[PDB]
Specification:
The structure is cut from a larger assembly and holds 7 protein chains of 7 kinds. With 107 residues, chain B is an alpha+beta fold. Chain B has 2 helices and 4 strands, in the order E-H-E-E-E-H. The chains are: A alpha+beta (95), B alpha+beta (107), C mainly alpha (97), D alpha/beta (148), E mainly alpha (140), F alpha+beta (166), G alpha/beta (190). Chain G binds 4 RNA strands through helix 1 and helix 4.
Chain lengths: 95, 107, 97, 148, 140, 166, 190
RNA sequence: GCUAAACCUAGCCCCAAACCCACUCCACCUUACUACCAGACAACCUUAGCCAAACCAUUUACCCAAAUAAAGUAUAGGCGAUAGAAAUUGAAACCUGGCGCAAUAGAUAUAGUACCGCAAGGGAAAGAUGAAAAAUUAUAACCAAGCAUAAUAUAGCAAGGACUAACCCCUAUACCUUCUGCAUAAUGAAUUAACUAGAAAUAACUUUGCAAGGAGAGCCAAAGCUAAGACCCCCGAAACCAGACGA
RNA sequence: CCGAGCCUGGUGAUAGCUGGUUGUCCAAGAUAGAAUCUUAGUUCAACUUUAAAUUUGCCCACAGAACCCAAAUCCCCUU
RNA sequence: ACUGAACUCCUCACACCCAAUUGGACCAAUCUAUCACCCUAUAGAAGAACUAAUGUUAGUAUAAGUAACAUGAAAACAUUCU
RNA sequence: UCUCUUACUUUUAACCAGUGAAAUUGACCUGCCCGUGAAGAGGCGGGCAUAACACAGCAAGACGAGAAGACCCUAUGGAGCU
């Protein structure tokens, strides 16, 4: 996506995925489930909880997001009071 | 291709097999170079195993030119006068040995 | 026909002349010259590339940004057209998307 | 390139297009994950394990007051001020095997690290810096090459 | 131009060399020759099996003819020879029939006698002394 | 271009021995850039080839074509050259060995067709070549006789042999 | 390669003069369809995939890698005995005759490279002989390089140059990580 | 044997440096290149559109004043495609070279000539001796397609297996492309010679180097970092818009 | 050659449509479907390919898999 | 009972029959660095390879020596005649 | 015009001589019947035919030359008009 710019000759990120998603340094991605703020009256509690809970993404679209994003979004970041520091690293993963 | 290429019937020179056998390869003429990476095979050949080759085959005669050459050649002359020029350009030692041996075998 | 009947004249190549014997000298100057000069400023060439690597459109945008103001009108027109074609090609056309 | 069509004609669509179908990132809603990331405050970690390692190697002397400038001169931690890291925070890990007695200056500090340093007899002091202040601190020489 | 091929002459004249003897504009031109020379080579390959088969059929015809000249037919002759344990392939059989018809007459008489032994056996399989020439050798 | 035909005469054979066959004097001659079609004058050339110069030039004189006169003046010039500076005793003791035609360096013009289309006219120039040889003309080979057919057939039947075996 | 810069440029169908309009129509005539003159197919046309202007083939290897290259080059020289050391560049005669004579006597080789510490201390005799000659080249310690020492069949060093090279290369091997480039001052590095 | 074939120069391209141009004999804005008379005649205006968004209608980089970095971040946006900074930092030389072409190449150029067009405008091709031509000497002879030298012989994609023998015998449904599937009576191709069409990023893999560090500021990192390698074509519309040219 | 002229320029306009796509040799290799102003296309899946870490993969032997109203199949330790 | 294959056996050697796609080993010619010197080697680079685009240019063939074209008559070449 | 055509003349035409084009052309040594076959065969299978080579006529076929079908469909191609 815009593999070369006219002003600097570099790749360019789509801010859509920035607004929608989040990346962890492991390479994984997380997202808010669709349909979580619409038509809640007819949805049963279990369903709306499935919608409230975050979810990961399979590797195809993970690669899609990684390709369209730049390395600035893939770097390591040391934030304060970040609930995702527990998860920016991976533990007990073989093959 | 057969029809485009000539043809012949089998025939041995002078019926060599009946009486005493004679190597139909008369003469060899090596043309090698001091320098040139292509001529290293021939240079090491004449270093090591031309001596024992001549000892094994006294009937054949060998001449070596050892002059400036981009491609080393070997010429073979037979009793009929048939000539066979072969390029040993950048070629392995054992393969050169096999080649010269089959040329000695060839009529 | 493409072949030539007669040989060409022999190319004389004096493998020992000024620059062939002097070649490469003063390239580690930065390393064993207490870092007074880097080899990028040492080379002779255009101003839009002195120690820079880049593909076609990168070079084009760089040379219009740097030396574009000094450029002739026809050259700058052809160059703008070139960057336009290259932008749309690299970004819209090809495999791998 | 294939036989025929956009594949070898070179006219395949942009990345993330599913033939008019609403793309994945388009159908997925927006949520406030990464907002003000360019304004969120950052600090690089530092472990007491690494600090003891550097003290043992002797690149930074505990006899003198340790500062982030001495850390950056010892290459204990890299700094990227224009990447909006306002300094360095200590880490609980490494409280054991620690006998530095250091008069450490820091930006952020863990209570356990503070307790360990105070047990070993050292001193901990926090000090806030600006972005450009931190730049000229972690790289003093380039700032002095200007004359300001 | 920075890189241009110069040996086109040679790399096409090799094809024309292989196609020299053809007829018409094929021998002269190249694109008319390439489509034909590769065809000739594929036919040279596929002609080997046909050579094998044709020469086999020719030996068959010759042997059948010589047998009928002696009054025998090829299937019976071959069956009797195999029964009598003589594996003479059709090439040498035809060559023998040509260059020494006396030995071929002997072979045909042998085959006929073996047919007669086989007919006696068809009459009585066992309960009889086996044919002298139908007798077999056992290897171990 | 090429003009080897004129050089063909410049050669000089070495002296011949007393006790050897007298060599027959041969010469070449040609004319260049005639306004006529080679396809047309080739007929004249192969008519005159294989006979005596006199009979040839007679046929040409009485042939109602344009190339015939040119050919006959060429032959007369060749005859005169041969007698004057080629050591030819008898001017009439000549016969043609090789008479041929060839294309020349032509010119290209325009003819106009209808509806604005145009065609190209190719003005034709032709070179003419002849080789003369002294001595009587060689006789034409008569048709092979029935006995010749028969002996060829029987020698073929005798040359055939067995195939695909010893 | 790194200092190389190309200069080839070829004109494309847009850069070649003319060729804007369509020469003949699409459907009327029996000729093939063509959009303009100066396409790559036509004579006088442009190049489709050609050398696109003055290119750059610049790229920098790591300082440590370059140091190791120099180290191993003069190492293999020392090993193959085409290396030689002397106290200084001094000779009374100072002529190419004596220089080539000494070379042929000591069995150095056809091509020789001389190394000196700085650019100013080369005596008149040596500088004049080397300027008159071409195969016996001279360089300061700064200009030393694998390319020249490989091209020259022999290499010649002086003790100050040896000390200089040892210092620099061992400093590279024991080097400390950079924070700001070494062009600027440091506590220990001059 | 002719037709032909072969050449190496002219010159040109890319950079760098340096700022550059005009008879001053006559004539040339009336119908230009025409020696000589009463007019009141004067310019300062957003570019748009193709295309992309797989439609299209908001929108879609094209510069206007330091190279690198920050940064493709802050931001904007049918929050979609896509567009996109700044503060701040801060570069080190003379120009006379070419891993640029050598007559289908390279400037279109032997020339903006011939030629075509009312006009704007479009726009070419080629040449080759030798030290001396006040030496036309002179095998340089040998090579593309095309012919003649030298027509023809039952029957067959023109060949192969072969054969004593060229043929006669057995075998064998031209090529490419497209297509479920072509000898197919589906396309393309007269033939020779020359020109003519896969350019690229992260992210991975291989090879080196160093290593809790790597990199010759800036960036990355829970064995990573730096360098190299290799990876993504050509021809073609009807159309649209702006400005000139034409009764 | 006016359903609206010709010339120049944007302009190498675009084209999911047609054609073409240049040296040699070896190997593996046609594969369920969904969505799409989508059905001459594309994205994912599936299949195919390459390099690596690990171990079970395939065939399958008894038992086992519904009331309503057949050939076979799923699962499956052994071999 | 026989005939009957690229099946199988038989002597020798074996990487040497699939579209799209993908993975590998070699390499023509060129410049460059370095060698070599009757034309080659090791490395890098690229305007790096054409039996086909109603492909462009030039030449030459088939159709074809075909279609098509032309000069009123006589004579002294002065004239005369239709 | 026709029943129902004929005869004559000029051109045309054919022959001799001069000059000398185009569209087309994969290579061709270019037969018929039946059958098959991408469903209509000069090229395939089975039969038949068969000294070679021109000139002049015919138009049955070569799905003949010609013009990238205008009819119909498709294109998230156009354009005019309302
Ligand atoms: Mg195609
Ligand atoms: Mg497709
Ligand atoms: Mg498109
Ligand atoms: Mg020829
Ligand atoms: Mg068999
Ligand atoms: Mg243009
Ligand atoms: Mg236009
Ligand atoms: Mg166009
Ligand atoms: Mg050009
Ligand atoms: Mg618009
Ligand atoms: Mg700034
Ligand atoms: Mg030109
Ligand atoms: Mg030109
Ligand atoms: Mg036949
Ligand atoms: Mg195709
Ligand atoms: Mg079909
Ligand atoms: Mg298919
Ligand atoms: Mg078929
Ligand atoms: Mg057909
Ligand atoms: Mg046909
Ligand atoms: Mg058709
Ligand atoms: Mg079609
Ligand atoms: Mg060609
Ligand atoms: Mg590439
Ligand atoms: Mg529009
Ligand atoms: Mg009027
Ligand atoms: Mg129009
Ligand atoms: Mg008009
Ligand atoms: Mg296009
Ligand atoms: Mg395979
Ligand atoms: Mg389509
Ligand atoms: Mg199981
Ligand atoms: Mg087998
Ligand atoms: Mg095998
Ligand atoms: Mg395939
Ligand atoms: Mg080679
Ligand atoms: Mg090319
Ligand atoms: Mg072609
Ligand atoms: Mg046509
Ligand atoms: Mg056609
Ligand atoms: Mg005709
Ligand atoms: Mg006529
Ligand atoms: Mg008339
Ligand atoms: Mg009548
Ligand atoms: Mg007629
Ligand atoms: Mg005529
Ligand atoms: Mg023509
Ligand atoms: Mg039929
Ligand atoms: Mg048939
Ligand atoms: Mg038949
Ligand atoms: Mg018809
Ligand atoms: Mg038709
Ligand atoms: Mg059509
Ligand atoms: Mg559609
Ligand atoms: Mg539309
Ligand atoms: Mg439109």
């Amino acid at each position: 996506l815009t593999y070369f710019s006219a002003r600097k000759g570099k790749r360019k990120t789509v801010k859509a995925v920035i607004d929608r998603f989040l990346r962890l340094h492991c390479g994984l991605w997380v997202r808010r489930k669709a349909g979580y703020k619409k038509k809640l009256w007819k949805k049963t509690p279990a369903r709306k909880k499935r919608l409230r809970e975050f979810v990961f993404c399979n590797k195809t679209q993970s690669k899609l997001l990684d390709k369209m994003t730049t390395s600035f979004w893939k770097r390591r970041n040391w934030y304060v009071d970040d609930p995702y520091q527990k998860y920016h690293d991976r533990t007990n993963l073989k093959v | 291709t057969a029809r485009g290429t000539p043809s012949r019937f089998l025939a041995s020179v002078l019926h060599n097999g009946l009486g005493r056998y004679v190597q139909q390869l008369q003469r060899l003429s090596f043309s090698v170079s001091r320098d040139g990476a292509s001529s290293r095979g021939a240079r090491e050949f004449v270093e090591r195993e031309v001596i024992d080759f001549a000892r094994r085959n006294p009937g054949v005669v060998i001449y070596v030119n050892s002059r400036p050459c981009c491609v080393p050649r070997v010429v073979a002359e037979y009793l009929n006068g048939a000539v066979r020029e072969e390029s040993i350009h950048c070629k392995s030692v054992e393969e050169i040995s096999t080649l010269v041996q089959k040329l000695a075998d060839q009529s | 026909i493409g072949i030539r009947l007669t040989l060409p004249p022999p190319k004389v190549v004096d493998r020992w002349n000024e620059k062939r014997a002097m070649f490469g000298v003063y390239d580690n100057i930065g390393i064993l010259g207490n870092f007074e000069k880097h080899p990028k400023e040492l080379i002779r060439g255009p101003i839009w590339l002195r120690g820079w690597k880049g593909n076609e459109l990168q070079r084009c945008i760089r040379k219009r940004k740097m030396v574009g103001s000094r450029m002739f009108a026809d050259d700058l027109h052809n160059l703008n057209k070139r960057i336009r074609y290259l932008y749309k090609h690299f970004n819209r056309h090809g495999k791998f998307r | 390139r294939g036989h025929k069509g956009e594949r070898q004609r070179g006219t395949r669509p942009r990345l993330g297009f599913e033939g008019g179908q609403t793309p994945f990132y388009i159908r997925i809603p927006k949520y406030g994950f990464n907002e003000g990331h360019s304004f969120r405050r950052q600090y690089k970690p530092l472990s007491l394990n690494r600090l003891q390692y550097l003290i043992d190697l002797g690149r930074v002397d505990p006899s003198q007051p340790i500062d982030l400038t001495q850390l950056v001169n010892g290459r204990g931690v890299t700094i990227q001020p224009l990447k909006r890291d306002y300094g360095v925070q200590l880490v609980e890990e490494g409280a054991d095997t620690f006998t530095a007695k250091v008069n450490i200056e820091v930006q952020l500090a863990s209570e356990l690290a503070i307790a360990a340093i105070e047990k070993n007899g050292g001193v901990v002091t926090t000090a806030f810096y600006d972005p450009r202040s931190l730049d000229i601190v972690c790289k003093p020489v380039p700032f002095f090459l200007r004359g300001q | 131009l920075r890189n241009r091929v110069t040996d086109r002459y040679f790399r096409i004249q090799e094809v024309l060399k292989h196609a020299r003897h053809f007829r018409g504009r094929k021998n002269r031109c190249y694109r008319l020759a390439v489509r034909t020379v590769i065809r000739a080579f594929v036919k040279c390959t596929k002609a080997r099996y046909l050579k094998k088969k044709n020469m086999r059929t020719l030996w068959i015809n010759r042997i059948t003819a010589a047998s009928q000249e002696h009054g025998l037919k090829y299937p019976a002759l071959i069956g009797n020879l195999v029964k009598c344990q003589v594996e003479l392939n059709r090439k040498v059989l035809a060559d023998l029939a040509i260059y020494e018809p006396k030995t071929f007459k002997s072979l045909a008489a042998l085959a006929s006698r073996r047919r007669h032994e086989g007919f006696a056996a068809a009459l009585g399989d066992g309960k009889e002394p086996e044919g002298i020439f139908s007798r077999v050798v056992q290897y171990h | 271009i090429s003009r080897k035909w004129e050089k063909k005469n410049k050669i000089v054979y070495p002296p011949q021995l007393p006790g050897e066959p007298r060599r027959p004097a041969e010469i070449y001659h040609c004319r260049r850039q005639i306004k006529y079609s080679k396809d047309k004058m080739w007929y004249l050339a192969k008519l005159i080839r294989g006979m005596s110069i006199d009979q040839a030039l007679a046929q040409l004189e009485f042939n109602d074509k344009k190339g015939a006169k040119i050919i006959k003046e060429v032959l007369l010039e060749a005859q005169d050259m041969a007698v004057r500076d080629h050591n030819v005793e008898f001017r009439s003791n000549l016969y043609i060995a090789e008479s041929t035609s060839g294309r020349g360096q032509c010119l290209k013009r325009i003819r106009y067709h209808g509806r604005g289309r145009f065609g190209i006219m190719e003005k034709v120039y032709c070179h003419y070549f002849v080789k003369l040889v002294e001595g009587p003309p060689p006789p034409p080979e008569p048709p092979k006789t029935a006995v010749a057919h028969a002996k060829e057939y029987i020698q073929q039947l005798r040359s055939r042999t067995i195939v695909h075996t010893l | 390669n790194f200092k190389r810069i190309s200069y080839a440029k070829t004109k494309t169908r847009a850069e070649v003069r003319g060729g804007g309009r369509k020469p003949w129509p699409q459907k009327g005539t029996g000729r093939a369809r063509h959009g303009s003159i100066r396409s790559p197919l036509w004579r006088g046309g442009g190049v489709a995939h050609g050398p696109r202007g003055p290119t750059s083939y610049y790229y920098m290897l790591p300082m440590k890698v370059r140091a190791l290259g120099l180290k191993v080059a003069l190492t293999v020289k020392l090993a193959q005995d085409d290396l030689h050391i002397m106290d200084s560049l001094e000779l009374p005669t100072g002529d190419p005759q004596y220089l080539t004579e000494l070379a042929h006597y000591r069995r150095w080789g056809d091509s020789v490279l001389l190394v000196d510490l700085t650019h100013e201390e080369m005596p008149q005799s040596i500088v004049e002989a080397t300027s008159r000659l071409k195969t016996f080249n001279l360089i300061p310690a700064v200009g030393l390089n694998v390319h020249s020492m490989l091209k020259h069949q022999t290499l010649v060093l002086t003790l100050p140059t040896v000390a200089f090279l040892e210092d620099k290369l061992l400093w590279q091997d024991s080097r400390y990580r950079p924070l700001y480039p070494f062009s600027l001052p440091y506590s220990d590095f001059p």
